[PDB]
Amino acid sequence: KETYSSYIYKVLKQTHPDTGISQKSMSILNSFVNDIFERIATEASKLAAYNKKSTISAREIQTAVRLILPGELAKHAVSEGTRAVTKYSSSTQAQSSSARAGLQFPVGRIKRYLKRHATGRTRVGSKAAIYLTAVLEYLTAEVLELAGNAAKDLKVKRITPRHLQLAIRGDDELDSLIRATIASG
Amino acid sequence: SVGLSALFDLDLDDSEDFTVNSS
């Protein structure tokens, strides 16, 4: 269980610059990132084993994302992961992998965490981590955009867990994803 | 901690703002 608060905050500022977020809301988003990560890492690793691979590559992350994410979320996320990997390889001057990939979330840490889920002699590809990092950032961004929107609609300045609730429960796919994810624990 | 199940009186949030160092 890790901390993504700083990064989550950076994503919030890209989409709702003048909207704040409470510590209680941040705690829940941190749980969101961790829980989703675990579900995707767990599936990807299994997928590598069944396809007889010794490395969890972006192909597997993609397959997992498609099994775990509903409908439109899966396709947009796939678009995001793919785009990040492409950027990452296209632009090599930047010092940070997150920066090369155009991400706010931490690619390096996500690679490290991804390792714990790789059981055997199985390896984690750099691209697998970039793809995963992009997906988590994207999901987090969707929740934040919707929660920020709910706060604005209610004429308030800060995102609370109630706004997170309205955003998630009011969106069929996110609701489905979260309920399924909860069932997973 | 507070997890996703919480979302299923959430407006009673008196927690302080999340902030990062300006320095």
Swiss-Prot record, chain A:
The modification N6-succinyllysine is found at K10. It is found in: Nucleus; Chromosome. The modification N6,N6-dimethyllysine is found at K1. Keywords: Acetylation, Chromosome, DNA-binding, Isopeptide bond, Methylation, Nucleosome core, Nucleus, Phosphoprotein, Ubl conjugation. There is a cross-link at K87 (Glycyl lysine isopeptide (Lys-Gly) (interchain with G-Cter in ubiquitin)). Monoubiquitinated by the RAD6/UBC2-BRE1 complex to form H2BK123ub1. H2BK123ub1 gives a specific tag for epigenetic transcriptional activation and is also prerequisite for H3K4me and H3K79me formation. H2BK123ub1 also modulates the formation of double-strand breaks during meiosis and is a prerequisite for DNA-damage checkpoint activation. Deubiquitination is performed by UBP8 in presence of SGF11. This is Histone H2B.1. The lineage of its organism: Eukaryota, Fungi, Dikarya, Ascomycota, Saccharomycotina. The gene is HTB1. The chain holds residues 38 to 131 of 131 of the full protein.
Curated annotation (Swiss-Prot), chain B:
The gene is SWR1. Present with 656 molecules/cell in log phase SD medium. Residues 9-17 have a biased composition (Acidic residues). The chain holds residues 599 to 629 of 1514 of the full protein. Component of the SWR1 chromatin-remodeling complex composed of at least ACT1, ARP4, RVB1, RVB2, ARP6, YAF9, VPS71, VPS72, SWC3, SWC4, SWC5, SWC7 and SWR1, and perhaps BDF1. It comes from the Eukaryota. Catalytic component of the SWR1 complex which mediates the ATP-dependent exchange of histone H2A for the H2A variant HZT1 leading to transcriptional regulation of selected genes by chromatin remodeling. It is found in: Nucleus. This is Helicase SWR1. Belongs to the SNF2/RAD54 helicase family. SWR1 subfamily.
